Amino acid sequence: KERIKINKNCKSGFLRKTVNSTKVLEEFNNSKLGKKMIIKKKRDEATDFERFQVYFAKRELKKKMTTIKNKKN
Amino acid sequence: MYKKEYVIDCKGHLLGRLASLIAKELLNGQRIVAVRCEDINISGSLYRNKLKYQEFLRLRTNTNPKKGPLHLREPSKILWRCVRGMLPHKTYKGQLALKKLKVCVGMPAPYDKKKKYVLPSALRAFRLKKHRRYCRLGTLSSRVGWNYDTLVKKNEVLRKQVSKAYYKKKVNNLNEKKEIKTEALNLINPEQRQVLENFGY
Amino acid sequence: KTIVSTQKVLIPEGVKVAINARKVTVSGKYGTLRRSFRHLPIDIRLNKLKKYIKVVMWFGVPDSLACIRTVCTHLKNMFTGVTKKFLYKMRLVHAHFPINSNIVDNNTRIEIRNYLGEKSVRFVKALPGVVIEKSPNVKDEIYVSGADIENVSLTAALIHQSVLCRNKDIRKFLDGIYVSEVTTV
Amino acid sequence: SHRKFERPRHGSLGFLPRKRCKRLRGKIRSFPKDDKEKPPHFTAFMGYKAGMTHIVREVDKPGSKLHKKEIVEACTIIECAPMVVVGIVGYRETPKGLRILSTVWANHVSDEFRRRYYKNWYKSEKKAFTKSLNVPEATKNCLLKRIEKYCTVLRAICHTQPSKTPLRMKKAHIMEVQINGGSMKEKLEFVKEMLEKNLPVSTVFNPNEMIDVISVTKGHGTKGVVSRYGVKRLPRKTHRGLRKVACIGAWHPARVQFQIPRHGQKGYFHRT
Amino acid sequence: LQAVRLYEKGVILGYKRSQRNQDPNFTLISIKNVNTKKHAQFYVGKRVAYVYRTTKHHDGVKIKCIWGKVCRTHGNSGVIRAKFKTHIPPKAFGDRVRILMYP
Amino acid sequence: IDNSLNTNIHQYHIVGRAIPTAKDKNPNVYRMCIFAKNDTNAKSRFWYFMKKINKLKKSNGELLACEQIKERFPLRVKNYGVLLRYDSRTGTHNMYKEFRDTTKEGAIAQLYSEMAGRHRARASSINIIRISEISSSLVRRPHIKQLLKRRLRFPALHLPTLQKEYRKKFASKRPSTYRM
RNA sequence: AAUUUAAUUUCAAUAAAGCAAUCCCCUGAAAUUGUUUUCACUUUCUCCCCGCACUAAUGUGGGGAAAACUGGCUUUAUUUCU
RNA sequence: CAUUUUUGGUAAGCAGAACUGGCGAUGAGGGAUGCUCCUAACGCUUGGAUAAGGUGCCUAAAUAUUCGCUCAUGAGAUCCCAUAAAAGGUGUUGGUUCAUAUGAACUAGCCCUGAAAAUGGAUGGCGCUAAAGCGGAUUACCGAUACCAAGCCAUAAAAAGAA
RNA sequence: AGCCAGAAACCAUGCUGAUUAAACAAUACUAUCUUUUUUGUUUGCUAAUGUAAAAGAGAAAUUAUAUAUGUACCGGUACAUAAAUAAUCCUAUCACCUUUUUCGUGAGCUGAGCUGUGAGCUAGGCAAUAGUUCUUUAACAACAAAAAAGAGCACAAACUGUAG
Structure with missing residues (x-):
């Protein structure tokens, strides 16, 4: 989606200066596709203990969430 | 593949590619239910396809049509025949692959309860240009007199409406599950909750 | 070939449009007309406030220009019709x-x-929304009217086709009912 | 090379195989088609051919050579004992054709009906339709409701009354009759009200109607080609026979081209 | 549940065919995850086990095993050649195989 | 570096001369630039031209220089005019074509692709006589004139393809053509 | 996955300076055998005028300016910011 | 029998020559199939990497990349090889000469017409049109008993030998 | 590009066959037998074994593709929401017994109380173990024994001759 307006003849210094100015990567990170990509990147790099911790956390959540489902009726 | 049954929604899929992908899977090993098979696309025009089917009808036998070829009229059987062409069906290995394939026009309801997959490279959109003529296989079959069409049209509509009622119920259920999950995310211990958030909840 | 081809289509003041996803609909004093163009893959966009339509094509070829x-032209005819x-x-x-010429079934x-003195009846029914009236003014004249130029013309063609002889000379025998004048009300 | 003189082929290819029918009873291939405006009514009837007579009839025939003048004509007489309806059939449309959902039966049936199922009526204990003697009326109603809701073609199971005849046979012929006319509900009401009654041909048909006739032909066993197909007979001089066959044909196909006339069954064929 | 599998799934394809020609020395293996030569190259030296069920008790049991090892690809989509200690049966084509995590 | 869009046709400046003899006490030295896929091909084309123009075959001459010629500004896109002699099935023709590209070598590859695709002309049957950078206003081809407009910003409008890893055999739901 | 010292008209930034504006690294178009000389060519999300929304467009068709941000050259240092 | 040169004969998978290579006397891999075309000549085995040739499926490898051109109411698709021409075309695509972005004239690319036969019927079949078509290019992968290394067998030659 | 009418041609319809579909549906009656649980299936026979594919065999919008789905108005209008689509979600793995508090659902008694089952919280000290890998027997289906519980046809023979 994002675009930055620049003069047509520009080279690497000006491109670096402009990218640093406009902070487009932050806009990308905020963007939903970017956000899906960065979440996936974390998941890809996650260690064995980290993987267990995600399992354990989801297990705690299901216990609490099911208890809330009991609560609601 | 690595699963008991692939069900394929064959609407919008191009004949040759759809057949080839199914065939290699059958050869690899897989039971495959081809579903919704009148809405398959041929890349030729309606007249051109009618001409081809005319040539197919013309092919018979002088001797005795009791020992002649089969001019199957079902759109599902047309796909089946094409897949058979893409198998070595006079072998045992080919026959076993042939037996693994199941074909159905429209959505049979026991396999509509099941999940439907698609073959993403094989869509009409995917490998054909917009400005070039094509023809739907059911339309062609109707042109050459298969004529079991209106019943399927009614059945598909009734199934689809129920599917809409199902989809809204599913959406209701998913929204409620999201709501309870978000509420009970607060109740998780902070560090564990932070980790679960980090990895995308 | 070209990257960009455009057209800017003037719209009359009274037109009530509803043209989404190339399913064009125009409504007006004489009727609501619907005509898909979904086989044609182009970016017609409407403008309500300052009127007009802008049609643009990406990556045109002379086929696209056609x-x-x-x-x-077709859209203009739809506006004209309603x-x-x-x-x-x-x-x-x-x-x-x-x-x-006996008009039955409410025009x-x-x-x-x-x-050709056949002593027999040819009945020729019209298409949807095309009225066949006769002229009070000129005895031979027949009015074929409706919201679409194609259906009225097709109706007229059907009437010509229905009449015409098998085998008595085309140069010699001139008899039959023909389209003299294409107008609007 | 081509034949010197042309001459139409002997007999119709379209009625191969020339073989015995698998039932004595006529078989309706197809029934009358949709007419929602018409009220529900029966489409068919079985009756027994008794013989032929001749008639004298007065003729109108405008502009005919005979015109006003009277004619003498051959005619057939068919004794028609009233058929009895005993069952209701509910069929539903599928892309594989019409399929029966269920059948609903009357609250009693004839001995003559039961005789058709038994091969040895004389030496049996006759236990057919005895668990199915009765069920709750609620069950019957549910089935009728179910058939109205889902079925799109209604047939009535009818049977002949051979006990009203001089014939040796005592087994009834049992038969489906499609009902054609209005809504499935209106049809269902019509069949239910009619059910246990007896139907005269006058209840089904009107005089002067044109009617389609479905029957198996008179037998003759296995016959020669001359008899079966009417080919021109062999010359006075032959090595062998005179009802003996013509040439079968070409070397190519290297097989008998099936369109050739052949010795085999003649009569006992199904015909409309 | 009670069992933990500790292998990855595969499908024993044919032997290492070429059009109308047979090499029975090398077997072709489909590994469920893989779809590239480069990804397949990760798993390249791994030990492979074909386990199969039989009619009678052999050494008191109705389960038997053939061992092999993966060794090189057979295409850009990562379908891999495996050499076994004895040839696997054509009867077992399209059956399942176990790809161990060692060495 | 690249092997995913790469052209291996390069330009070589080649210099050679006649061997000194009693007749040819002072030789004539000849230079030309030649577009080829390799140095042997470049030399053989240079030798063919030496044969076609002069009386000098490989035997009669000696090579002074062959060197690949270097792109001044590869990041800059430039307007190349190219002048051809080519052979058809039934005749020989001259033609002058325009290509906007980064470099002359890309243009020659494009030219061979164009002549092959549109005219069925193989590389062997084409001879480039001059390829050079020319002013933008002097181009005759509409497709290049369209690029040379002030504001260029078309919608992309092409199919996804990804790569082998994420080239899935089957899918749960149907793809998104628009991509936005 | 790399790696060594060469070779071959190969850069790009870094931040301070300068230099020229249809001008310049360039690239055009012109007056046996060498020269060499002429004027043609950048940007703009800057400003103005006409057409005032006239556009494919978060603008625009035509006509003019402005600058040197952009690019280009000369420097002075700097290279794991790049 | 084949390429090339070639004589007779309307021509001929016809008759007759020349040079060379094949087959005969020869497996093997490709040419969809095929004594002869192409690749290539062979003990028994293991492994490699390639050739001719392929890589939509049958059928092993790419629904690869990359630029063109191509829609056909009987398209087209690997030498030999199983038809095809003169001649047309306001179908589309490039060129080139003229005139005043339009009007002419030519030109060759594709496509169309020219283009009819005998069981039912043959791009090998299914199929393929954002090609799996035609013309290129870019790689990777697959691909032989040919190629390299290793073992073993026999044959040939050579070493060397009468605690 | 988009269309229309239009032939003894074409495909259905019609009609004939359909052990051409190694096809099938509905109905009727019947064979100490069916159903649930346990143990077994290392004189031609008389206890009895077979699986081409268990390993989380997990996953039901939809027309689409030069835009979709809801919601609100009258098949159209307006307003939201998807757009790496399985690159996602679901989902396992807190053995034990024993102390404590809550919620779902089944069963027995005369709505409710209790028990069972499923899910959690709270407290304790309690298990595993074969000397290094060569299947991790973990899946489906069938059968034999043992208990417990459930409920007559056809052919022939004579007769026929619409048949041969």
């Missing part, structure tokens, strides 16, 4: 026999009798 010019119905005035020619089916 499509743009065709669509704009604002004022298209009237095809058909004169009935005969050099010998009275040919009897929907013209009965024709006696082409």
Whole structure:
């Protein structure tokens, strides 16, 4: 989606200066596709203990969430 | 593949590619239910396809049509025949692959309860240009007199409406599950909750 | 070939449009007309406030240019039709026999009798929304009117086709009912 | 090379195989088609051919050579004992054709009906339709409701009354009759009200009607080609026979081209 | 549940065919995850086990095993050649195989 | 570096001369630039031209220089005019074509692709006589004139393809053509 | 996955300076055998005028300016910011 | 029998020559199939990497990349090889000469017409049109008993030998 | 590009066959037998074994593709929401017994109380173990024994001759 307006003849210094100015990567990170990509990147790099911790956390959540489902009726 | 049954929604899929992908899977090993098979696309025009089917009808036998070829009229059987062409069906290995394939026009309801997959490279959109003529296989079959069409049209509509009622119920259920999950995310211990958030909840 | 081809299509003041996803709909004093263009893959966009439509094509070829010019002409006809119905005035020619034009079914089916003295009936029903009236003013004249130029013309063509002889010379025998004048109300 | 003189082929290819029918009872291939405006009514009837007579009839026939003058004509007489309806059939449309959902039966049946199922009526204990003697009326109603809701074609199971005849046979012929006319509900009401009654041909048909006739032909066993197909007979001089066959044909196909006339069954064929 | 599998799934395809020609020395293996030569190259030296069920008790049991090892690809989509200690049966084509995590 | 869009046709400046003899006490030295896929091909084309123009075959001459010629500004896109002699099935023709590209070598590859695709002309049957950078206003081809407009910003409008890893055999739901 | 010292008209930034504006690294178009000389060519999300929304467009068709941000050259240092 | 040169004969998978290579006397891999075309000549085995040739499926490898051109109401698709021409075409695509972005004239690319036969019927079949078509290019992968290394067998030659 | 009418041609319809579909549906009656649980299936026979594919065999919008789905108005209008689509979600793995508090659902008694089952919280000290890998027997289906519980046809023979 994002675009930055620049003069047509520009080279690497000006491109670096402009990218640093406009902070487009932050806009990308905020963007939903970017956000899906960065979440996936974390998941890809996650260690064995980290993987267990995600399992354990989801297990705690299901216990609490099911208890809330009991609560609601 | 690595699963008991692939069900394929064959609407919008191009004949040759759809057949080839199914065939290699059958050869690899897989039971495959081809579903919704009148809405398959041929890349030729309606007249051109009618001409081809005319040539197919013309092919018979002088001797005795009791020992002649089969001019199957079902759109599902047309796909089946094409897949058979893409198998070595006079072998045992080919026959076993042939037996693994199941074909159905429209959505049979026991396999509509099941999940439907698609073959993403094989869509009409995917490998054909917009400005070039094509023809739907059911339309062609109707042109050459298969004529079991209106019943399927009614059945598909009734199934689809129920599917809409199902989809809204599913959406209701998913929204409620999201709501309870978000509420009970607060109740998780902070560090564990932070980790679960980090990895995308 | 070209990257960009455009057209800017003027719209009359009274037109009530509803053209989403190339399913064009125009409504006006004489009717609501619907006409898909979804086989044609182009970016018609509406402008309500300052009127007009802008049609643009990406990556045009002369085929595409033909499509743009065709669509704009077709759209203009749709506007023209709803604002004022298209009237095809058909004169009935005969050099010998009275040919009897009896309009039945509330201006929907013209009965024709006696082409070349045949003593028999040709009934020719109209298409949806195309009225067949006769002229009070000129005895041979027949009014074929409706919101679409294509259906009225097709209706007129059906009437010509229905009449015409098998095998008595085309140069010699001139009799039959023909489209004289294409107008609107 | 081509034949010197042309001459139409002997017999119709379209009625191969020339073989015995698998039932004595006529078989309706197809029934009358949709007419929602018409009220529900029966489409068919079985009756027994008794013989032929001749008639004298007065003729109108405008502009005929005979015209006003009277004619003598051959005619057939068919004794028609009233058929009895005993069952209701509910069929539903599928892309594989019409399929029966269920059948609903009357609250009693004839001995003559039961005789058709038994091969040895004399030496049996006759236990057919005895668990199915009765069920709750609620069950019957549910089935009728179910059939109205889902079925799109209604047939009535009818049977002949051979006990009203001089014939040796005592087994009834049992038969489906499609009902053609209005809504499935209106049809269902019509069949239910009619059910246990007896139907005269006058209840089904009107005089002067044109009617389609479905029957198996008179037998003759296995016959020669001359008899079966009417080919021109062999010359006075032959090595062998005179009802003996013509040439079968070409070397190519290297097989008998099936369109050739052949010795085999003649009569006992199904015909409309 | 009670069992933990500790292998990855595969499908024993044919032997290492070429059009109308047979090499029975090398077997072709489909590994469920893989779809590239480069990804397949990760798993390249791994030990492979074909386990199969039989009619009678052999050494008191109705389960038997053939061992092999993966060794090189057979295409850009990562379908891999495996050499076994004895040839696997054509009867077992399209059956399942176990790809161990060692060495 | 690249092997995913790469052209291996390069330009070589080649210099050679006649061997000194009693007749040819002072030789004539000849230079030309030649576009080829390799140095042997470049030399053989240079030798063919030496044969076609002069009386000098490989035997009669000696090579002074062959060197690949270097792109001044590869990041800059430039307007190349190219002048051809080519052979058809039934005749020989001259033609002058325009290509906007980064470099002359890309243009020659494009030219061979164009002649092959549109005219069925193989590389062997084409001879480039001059390829050079020319002013933008002097181009005759509409497709290049369209690029040379002030504001260029078309919608992309092409199919996804990804790569082998994420080239899935089957899918749960149907793809998104628009991509936005 | 790399790696060594060469070779071959190969850069790009870094931040301070300068230099020229249809001008310049360039690239055009012109007056046996060498020269060499002429004027043609950048940007703009800057400003103005006409057409005032006239556009494919978060603008625009035509006509003019402005600058040197952009690019280009000369420097002075700097290279794991790049 | 084949390429090339070639004589007779309307021509001929016809008759007759020349040079060379094949087959005969020869497996093997490709040419969809095929004594002869192409690749290539062979003990028994293991492994490699390639050739001719392929890589939509049958059928092993790419629904690869990359630029063109191509829609056909009987398209087209690997030498030999199983038809095809003169001649047309306001189908589309490039060129080139003229005139005043339009009007001419030519030109060759594709496509169309020219283009009819005998069981039912043959791009090998299914199929393929954002090609799996035609013309290129870019790689990777697959691909032989040919190629390299290793073992073993026999044959040939050579070493060397009468605690 | 988009269309229309239009032939003894074409495909259905019609009609004939359909052990051409190694096809099938509905109905009727019947064979100490069916159903649930346990143990077994290392004189031609008389206890009895077979699986081409268990390993989380997990996953039901939809027309689409030069835009979709809801919601609100009258098949159209307006307003939201998807757009790496399985690159996602679901989902396992807190053995034990024993102390404590809550919620779902089944069963027995005369709505409710209790028990069972499923899910959690709270407290304790309690298990595993074969000397290094060569299947991790973990899946489906069938059968034999043992208990417990459930409920007559056809052919022939004579007769026929619409048949041969």
